[PDB]
RNA sequence: CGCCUCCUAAAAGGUAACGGAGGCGCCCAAAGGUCCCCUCAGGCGGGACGGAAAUCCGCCGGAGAGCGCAAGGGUAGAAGGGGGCCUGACUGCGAGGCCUGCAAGCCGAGCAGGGGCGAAAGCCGGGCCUAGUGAACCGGUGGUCCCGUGUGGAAGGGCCA
């Protein structure tokens, strides 16, 4: 008396929002206090010369400096502003 | 089978290639051609050859039972979780290295893997040990 | 009292040099003399709080300079793999001299000293050659008389040796305080 | 309503600045200190509920 | 059927699916400041009330114990464990950037008043961080002391909190 389908919605409500962070400000590029440059959710990034890591382990400009790409191999990844020209 | 106590649900799908080779006691079973083998398949050809072997002296291993495939429902229409485990197997796909050994000392052994594999389920090989291989 | 205070004092002196080139022949080293010491005792879980606390107290106290509070089941022994912090942490680990007028007292005038205190125990310290041994009932008396039915008992003590290896730690507080039996 | 109820700061008569706060623990307990615009920082005091 | 975390985003970033998984719609009055000290679990060996596992001694150790809460990142060159003193979990504010079409949300040197931790080289405009969140209307209260429908006041009302 009525063979149509099966109810069947085991459920998996799963999500999470976008985001952001990252290596993100380019090689040598103009680099200004305010411009923010690599933002780490973790400490991939030591804030080295003027680079200023903000409340939020977030790489921010602390001068105006040439983009200072410091990897300083080891110690780890070292970020520096250098003194603009 | 045996995929016991595992940890998740289940897999995905793909297949290429992999690494099974070496030799582990001269009577081996080599696939070639397939992808994921029932665990049960599996168990199949142990027995074959478990029996074929006047049934005592110990055969090997190989490959695993796995991964966890799923038919989900049970013929529905789909759109479930995908949900549902239920078959158990192999995931190996480029000629590989299934060893068994027992003692037969012969083309008896031979027997035992013809039908165990012919059996199983591909297109594959056997042979014996035929470059060694050094490790550290 | 002091009197065993000069006592330690010359036992050991002498000894050290004594046995110290007897075997030694280093350069009169810590080959093999002792160091600082430690005690310990039957943590608070054995507590009452006030009550054998305080008693812990009075005992710490008379024996060396410190004595407890009300404090001895907190993360509780509960029921078996049941506990938390820590907070009974019941020990004394005064330094130098004042523990050789102990060594003194404590191993050499208290030794033996009540239900038949004999002392027959293997490989005493053993453990690198620093300690071991902090028997299982009070030196009774070593003043006090019943400030509490039950009391103390669970007393354990220990050294911080340089009596390097053991036979030669041996040779230490073997003659220098009394090696209990085989 | 939990034992998280919010409060604020106002200071001797002269101002008040705000906040939120709680209830649990030290419950009422609320002196505090934080400086309004009275005067140039001042004490302030804080409670007022 | 809102948000955080991991996978699949396939390597920039970034994307469905009735795709996998799994948490939050608290608080912490001091896990909020700073100054001074300290420094894991676990392995082994030796030990009172032990007695697989406290407490203490003796070694050993890319730190896998740890950080309210889930994951992930980090990370004891401690954000982690202990002591002292204290409120900036400040108002005025910010240049200049993260992402975003909207509004959002988010990062912040430095100038001012004003303090607090050291003697100070300086840190502090809440916490170790990524979730604890809600326009607009409407109306309340603590202001303020701007407006008042001739003028004085006032019902009432504008901006602040």
Request: hydrophobic content about 35%; charged content about 30%; overall charge positive.
């Amino acid at each position: 008396m009525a063979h149509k389908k099966g109810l069947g919605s085991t459920r998996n409500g799963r999500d999470s929002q976008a985001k952001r962070l990252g290596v993100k400000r380019y090689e040598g590029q103009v680099v200004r206090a305010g411009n923010i440059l690599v933002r780490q959710r973790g400490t991939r990034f030591k804030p080295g010369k003027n680079v200023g890591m903000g409340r939020d382990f977030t790489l921010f400009a602390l001068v105006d400096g040439v983009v200072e790409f410091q990897d300083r191999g080891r110690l780890g990844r070292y970020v520096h502003v250098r003194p603009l020209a | 089978r045996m995929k016991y106590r595992k940890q998740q649900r289940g897999r995905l799908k793909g297949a290429t290639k992999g690494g099974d080779y070496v030799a582990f006691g001269d009577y081996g079973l080599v696939a070639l051609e397939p992808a994921w083998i029932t665990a049960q398949q599996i168990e199949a050809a142990r027995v074959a050859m478990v029996r074929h072997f006047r049934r005592g002296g110990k055969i090997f291993i190989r490959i695993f039972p796995d991964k966890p495939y799923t038919k989900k429902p049970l013929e529905v229409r789909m759109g479930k979780g995908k949900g549902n485990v239920e078959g158990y197997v192999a995931v190996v796909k480029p000629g590989r290295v299934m060893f068994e050994v027992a003692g037969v000392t012969e083309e008896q052994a031979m027997e035992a893997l013809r039908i165990a594999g012919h059996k199983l389920p591909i297109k594959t090989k056997i042979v014996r040990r035929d470059a060694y291989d050094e490790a550290q | 009292m002091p009197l065993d205070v000069a006592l330690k004092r010359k036992y050991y002196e002498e000894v050290r040099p004594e046995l110290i080139r007897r075997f030694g022949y280093q350069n009169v080293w810590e080959v093999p003399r002792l160091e600082k010491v430690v005690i310990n005792q039957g943590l608070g879980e054995a507590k009452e709080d006030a009550r054998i606390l305080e008693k812990a107290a009075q005992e710490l106290a008379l024996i060396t300079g410190q004595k407890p509070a009300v404090t001895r089941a907190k993360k509780s022994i509960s029921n078996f793999k049941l506990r938390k912090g820590m907070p009974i942490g019941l020990r004394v680990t005064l330094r130098r001299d004042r523990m050789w007028i102990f060594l003194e007292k404590l191993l050499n005038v208290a030794l033996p000293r009540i239900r038949d205190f004999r002392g027959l125990n293997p490989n005493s310290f053993d453990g690198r050659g620093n300690y071991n041994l902090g028997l299982r009932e009070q030196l009774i008396f070593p003043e006090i008389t019943y400030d509490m039915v039950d009391a103390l008992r669970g007393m354990d003590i220990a050294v911080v040796t340089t009596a390097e290896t053991d036979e030669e730690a041996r040779a230490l507080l073997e003659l220098l305080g009394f090696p209990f039996r085989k | 309503r939990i034992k998280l109820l919010l409060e604020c700061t106002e200071c001797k008569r002269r101002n008040y600045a705000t906040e939120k706060n709680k209830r649990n623990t030290p419950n009422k307990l609320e002196l505090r200190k934080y400086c309004p615009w009275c005067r140039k920082h001042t004490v302030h005091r804080e409670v007022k509920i």
